[PDB]
C-alpha cells in the first residue's frame, strides 16, 4: 500500500498544480474560478480520467491504436491527442528554462529580486516596505519582466534572442535527451526524496504564506465568489480546461500508462485517489499563493487583484517574494527552484517518452527497425528546441501565453473529451463499455460514471463551447495588452491543428474504404475483433 502511494507520488503533483492553477485562479478573480472548477471536476474530470485509463487497459497499446478496437471512424482522437502532446512538449519546457535561469541567479550572496539597485532597473522602483509613503514598481515584478524576461512592448516586436535563456533551454533539453536515451528514472532509493521534497517545500511555503501579516485578505479574495458579474465564458473554459490539463487527460498519455497496468487493484479506487489528491494539492497551493498575494497587497497598499501579473509569471513573482522573507533567503530560493526543476523534469520525461512511443508505434517499419530510435529522439529534441526558441526572444512571453491558451489547452481539450465520451456512450455503447469494465475490473462503473459520460460531460463541453462562441472575448496578455488579429489567428490555428484531426481522419477513412457509403460507415463503425 505504501509503495503504491509512493509510485503515485511521482505523478499526482506537477507544475500544473503549483504554477498553472494559481495564475488561472488569479486571472479569473479568485473565488469565482473555484465554482466551475469543482463543477467540471466532479462532472467530467474523474469520469474522463477513469474512462481513458479503462481504454488504455482494455487495448493494452498506444492511445492511437485503441480507437481501432473501439471505433475505427473516430481514430482521429488519438492523432489529436498526439499533436496535443507534441505542442505541449514545446512550450512546457520554457517553464523549466525560466526555473533554471532563476536557479543560476540564486547562486549569489543576495537575491537580485530582493532590491532594485541594478542596471536593468527602472527609476520608478520603490521598496515594498517604503512604498506606502505614484506609478511605482515592485523590484520583484520588474526583475521578472526585465532581467529574466526582457519583456517586449508587444508580440509584433520579437526583439533579440536571449542567449542566457537559450542556453537554459539547451541545458534542459540535453538533460531530457540523456535521461530518455539512458532510461533514467526515479526507481531506487531516490524515489523517496524525489516524491517527498516537493511537498516539504510546498508545506514550508504555505506556512510562510499563512503567517504573513496580510494573508487574511488574500485568503478572503481566494475563496469569496463573485457570481454577480464574474460569470463569463472565459472563467468556465479556464476552469474546465484546467481539470483536463492537470490530469494530463485528452493527451493520450494516460492510455499508454494504462497499457502498462496489467490488471485492477480497484483501478476505480486508484483513479479516484489520483484525481482527488491532484485537485487537492492544487487547492492547497492556492492558499499559499493567495496568502503571498494578500501580504503583498497589504505591504504595497494596492488591491489584491492588481498586485502581480495576471499570467504565467505569477509563480515567478509570488514565490520569490515568499522566499525573500525566510531566514537565509538564498538557501530556500535554491531549494525551491531545485524542487520546481525536478517536478517539471519528471513530467517532461513522461511526456516525451509517451510522444516517442506513440510516434515509433505509428511507423515501426523504419523508426523502430533498429538503433534509429535514438536518432529519432535526438531529432524530436532538436526540433522541439528550435520551436521553443521562438519563446526565448524578448517578445517570447506573448508567444508562450498564446501557446498555453490555445495549443495544449482551451477548446481543443473540450473537443477531445466530448468526442471520447460521445463515442463511448452512444456509438460504441455505454452498455458495451460497462460490460467491458465488468470483464476487466469485476464491477460496472455505476450510475455516476455512466450518466456522466452519457450526458454530463458532452453537455458541459458543448455548453462551454457555445457560450464562448456567443460571448467571445479576445485573449489578452496580463489584463491590459490586446493581441493583434494575426496572433489570435495563429492561436486558433494551433487549436485547430488538434481539433481538425478527427474530421480529417473521418473523411480519409471514408474515402479509403470500399463499398457504398452506408457500407463504408457500417464497416468503420463496427469495432475490430
Amino acid at each position, epitope marked *: 500500500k505504501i509503495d503504491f502511494v509512493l509510485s503515485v507520488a511521482g505523478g499526482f503533483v506537477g507544475l500544473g498544480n503549483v504554477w498553472r492553477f494559481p495564475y488561472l485562479c488569479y486571472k479569473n478573480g479568485g473565488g469565482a474560478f473555484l465554482i466551475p472548477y469543482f463543477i467540471f471536476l466532479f462532472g467530467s474530470g474523474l469520469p474522463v480520467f477513469f474512462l481513458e485509463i479503462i481504454i488504455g487497459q482494455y487495448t493494452s497499446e498506444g492511445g492511437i491504436t485503441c480507437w481501432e478496437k473501439i471505433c475505427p471512424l473516430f481514430s482521429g482522437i488519438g492523432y489529436a491527442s498526439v499533436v496535443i502532446v507534441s505542442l505541449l512538449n514545446v512550450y512546457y519546457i520554457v517553464i523549466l528554462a525560466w526555473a533554471t535561469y532563476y536557479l543560476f541567479q540564486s547562486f549569489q550572496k543576495e537575491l537580485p529580486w530582493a532590491h532594485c539597485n541594478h542596471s536593468w532597473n527602472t527609476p520608478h522602483c520603490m521598496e515594498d516596505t517604503m512604498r506606502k509613503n505614484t506609478n511605482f514598481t515592485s523590484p520583484v515584478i520588474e526583475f521578472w519582466e526585465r532581467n529574466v524576461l526582457s519583456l517586449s512592448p508587444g508580440i509584433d516586436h520579437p526583439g533579440s534572442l536571449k542567449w542566457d535563456l537559450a542556453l537554459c533551454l539547451l541545458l534542459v533539453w540535453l538533460v531530457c535527451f540523456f535521461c530518455i536515451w539512458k532510461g533514467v528514472r526515479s526507481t531506487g532509493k531516490v524515489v523517496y526524496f524525489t516524491a517527498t521534497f516537493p511537498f516539504a517545500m510546498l508545506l514550508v511555503l504555505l506556512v510562510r504564506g499563512l503567517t504573513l501579516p496580510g494573508a487574511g485578505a488574500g485568503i478572503k479574495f481566494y475563496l469569496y465568489p463573485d457570481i454577480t458579474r464574474l460569470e463569463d465564458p472565459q472563467v468556465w473554459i479556464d476552469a474546465g480546461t484546467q481539470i483536463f490539463f492537470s490530469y494530463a487527460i485528452c493527451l493520450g498519455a494516460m492510455t499508454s500508462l494504462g497499457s502498462y497496468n496489467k490488471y485492477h487493484n480497484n483501478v476505480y479506487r486508484d483513479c479516484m485517489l489520483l484525481g482527488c489528491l491532484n485537485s487537492g494539492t492544487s487547492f492547497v497551493s492556492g492558499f499559499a499563493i493567495f496568502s503571498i498575494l494578500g501580504f503583498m497587497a497589504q505591504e504595497q497598499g494596492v488591491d489584491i487583484a492588481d498586485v502581480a501579473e495576471s499570467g504565467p509569471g505569477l509563480a515567478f513573482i509570488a514565490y520569490p517574494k515568499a522566499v525573500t522573507m525566510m531566514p537565509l533567503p538564498t538557501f530556500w530560493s535554491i531549494l525551491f527552484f531545485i524542487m520546481l526543476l525536478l517536478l517539471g523534469l519528471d513530467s517532461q520525461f513522461v511526456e516525451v517518452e509517451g510522444q516517442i512511443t506513440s510516434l515509433v508505434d505509428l511507423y515501426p517499419s523504419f523508426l523502430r527497425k533498429g538503433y534509429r530510435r535514438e536518432i529519432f529522439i535526438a531529432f524530436v529534441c532538436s526540433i522541439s528546441y528550435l520551436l521553443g526558441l521562438t519563446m526565448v526572444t524578448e517578445g517570447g512571453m506573448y508567444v508562450f501565453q498564446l501557446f498555453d491558451y490555445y495549443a495544449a489547452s482551451g477548446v481543443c481539450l473540450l473537443w477531445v473529451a466530448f468526442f471520447e465520451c460521445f463515442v463511448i456512450a452512444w456509438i460504441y455503447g455505454g452498455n458495451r463499455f460497462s*460490460e467491458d469494465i465488468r470483464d476487466m475490473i*469485476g464491477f460496472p462503473p455505476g450510475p455516476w460514471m455512466k450518466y456522466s459520460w452519457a450526458v454530463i460531460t458532452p453537455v458541459l463541453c458543448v455548453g462551454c463551447f457555445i457560450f464562448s462562441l456567443v460571448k467571445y472575448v479576445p485573449l489578452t496578455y496580463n489584463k491590459t495588452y490586446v493581441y493583434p488579429n494575426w496572433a489570435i489567428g495563429l492561436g486558433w490555428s494551433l487549436a485547430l491543428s488538434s481539433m481538425l484531426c478527427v474530421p480529417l481522419v473521418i473523411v480519409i477513412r471514408l474515402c479509403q474504404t470500399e463499398g457504398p457509403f452506408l457500407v463504408r460507415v457500417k464497416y468503420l463503425l463496427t469495432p475490430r475483433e
Partner: antibody, heavy 118, light 107 residues
C-alpha cells in the same frame, strides 16, 4: 432481484443431450451477469459456466469447457444451459446464480433442478 | 485450477460456544475476491459474507470474517440453533471459479 427459478431437469442416458432453463424476474436481467453452479450428490459445489450481462464474454469450467454451452435471452429474461455429451459424473443439481459483481459474489440463488444420467 | 480446501469438514458444536472455521487456498486470492455461502439442509446456498469482511443483508452481526493472501477464516461469536448449516468458501479472483470443501455444523 426476487425470484430465480430453474426448469428442464430430468432423467437422461449417458451420451445424451439436455437443455436447462433458468427464468429470472424482479430485476433487469440484461444488466446482471449469470452463472451456473453444480451441486453433486456428495454435496460438493462445482462451478460450471458464467455468461456476462450481454453475453459477449463466456467462461467455462475445465470439465465442461468443450461439452456444455451457456446462453441467455435478454428479451425473454431467461437463462439456458445446453448439454451435448453428458457423462456418468454429470448427475447433480444445477443452480443459476447472479454474479454481476465479482467482489460481491453470488447474491441470489435459484431453487435448482436435479439432473440424473442413469 | 485454484483448489480451495477447508480443514474442519465435520464439527460437533454446542449452543453458546464460539466456533471458527478456516479456508485454505492453493493460490493467492485477493481479499475482495473471497466470499462465503451458507446452505441450509434441503435448501439452496445463500450468500453470507463477501469481501472477507462485509456481511450480507440477511446474516446477523453474529458472524464475522478475516484473512488475507492464502488463509481465510470466519468465526461465530456465539452459535445459535439456526446456525447449523454448511458454509463454503469461494474465490472469485480467477477462472475457473472454485468452492471450498465445506463445513457442515453439527449441533
Amino acid at each position: 432481484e426476487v425470484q430465480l427459478v430453474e426448469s428442464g431437469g430430468g432423467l437422461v442416458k449417458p451420451g445424451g443431450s439436455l437443455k436447462l432453463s433458468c427464468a429470472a424476474s424482479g430485476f433487469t436481467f440484461s444488466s446482471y451477469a449469470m452463472s451456473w453452479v453444480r451441486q453433486s450428490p456428495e454435496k460438493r459445489l462445482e462451478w460450471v459456466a458464467e455468461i456476462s450481462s450481454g453475453g459477449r464474454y463466456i467462461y467455462y469450467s475445465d470439465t465442461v469447457t468443450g461439452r456444455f454451452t451457456i446462453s441467455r435471452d435478454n428479451a425473454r429474461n431467461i437463462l439456458h444451459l445446453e448439454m451435448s455429451s453428458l457423462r456418468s459424473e454429470d448427475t447433480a443439481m444445477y443452480y443459476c446464480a447472479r454474479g454481476e459483481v465479482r467482489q460481491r459474489g453470488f447474491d441470489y440463488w435459484g431453487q435448482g433442478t436435479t439432473l440424473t444420467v442413469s | 485450477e485454484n483448489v480451495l480446501t477447508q480443514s474442519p469438514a465435520i464439527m460437533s458444536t454446542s449452543p453458546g460456544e464460539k466456533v471458527t472455521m478456516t479456508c485454505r487456498a492453493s493460490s493467492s486470492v485477493g481479499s475482495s475476491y473471497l466470499h462465503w455461502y451458507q446452505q441450509k439442509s434441503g435448501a439452496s446456498p445463500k450468500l453470507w459474507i463477501y469481501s472477507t469482511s462485509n456481511l450480507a443483508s440477511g446474516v446477523p452481526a453474529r458472524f464475522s470474517g478475516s484473512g488475507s493472501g492464502t488463509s481465510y477464516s470466519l468465526t461465530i461469536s456465539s452459535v445459535e440453533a439456526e446456525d447449523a448449516a454448511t458454509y463454503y468458501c469461494q474465490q472469485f479472483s480467477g477462472y475457473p471459479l472454485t468452492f471450498g470443501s465445506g463445513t457442515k455444523l453439527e449441533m
